[PDB]
Symmetry: C4
Subunit: 31 residues, 4 copies
């Protein structure tokens, strides 16, 4: 249902942390 | 509910800005 | 509603094209 | 409906594999 959608969206909002920080890995290889 | 899903999707559609621009950071280190 | 969620998910499934191809920009700068 | 949303979210949770591994492509070009 809606509860087990809301708590996928809060997995995606983990993936969009690990997007940011595993880019910021690459950027801080490049400064 | 559906309102507080719709307004996660419009957080994701912020993350997919910061995807693009913090890639375009890396690409403009690389031209 | 559900129709205007489904057609955000099919924006995200555009962003996850432009993820892939604007990475594949960087990778083809790096081969 | 909700079933064919849940099974988009489990496409996105494929895209957020291919995010990670096609970054980890770039990082392992850069070590």
């Amino acid at each position: 249902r809606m509860k087990x959608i809301e708590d996928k969206l809060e997995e995606i909002x983990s993936k969009x942390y690990h997007x940011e920080n595993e880019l910021a890995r690459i950027k801080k290889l490049l400064x």
